[PDB]
Amino acid sequence: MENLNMDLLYMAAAVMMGLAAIGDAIGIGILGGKFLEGAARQPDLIPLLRTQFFIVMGLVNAIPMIAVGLGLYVMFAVA
């Protein structure tokens, strides 16, 4: 089992990664929300905090998506 067991082990890894990654990717995600009130200090940063946020939104989902994304592609590549 060169492509039967490895998958398992990997899973533990990838899976693990997704967690951590999610964490960070979240740190920002939640930040975007914790920024609203923050930027609230300046009414000249309403369309900004939002703009920067939105991006952070996708990028945040790009951290894991790209993380597990690659991992998968690889797995399906050699398995």
UniProtKB/Swiss-Prot annotation:
Transmembrane regions: 11-31, 53-73
Cellular-component GO terms for this entry: plasma membrane; proton-transporting ATP synthase complex; proton-transporting two-sector ATPase complex, proton-transporting domain
Pfam family membership, one: ATP-synt_C
Localisation: Cell inner membrane
GO terms classed as biological process: proton motive force-driven ATP synthesis; proton motive force-driven plasma membrane ATP synthesis
Primary location: membrane
Matches recorded under NCBIfam families: ATP_synt_c, PRK06876.1
Name of protein: ATP synthase subunit c
Organism, scientific name: Escherichia coli (strain K12)
Recorded name of the encoding gene: atpE
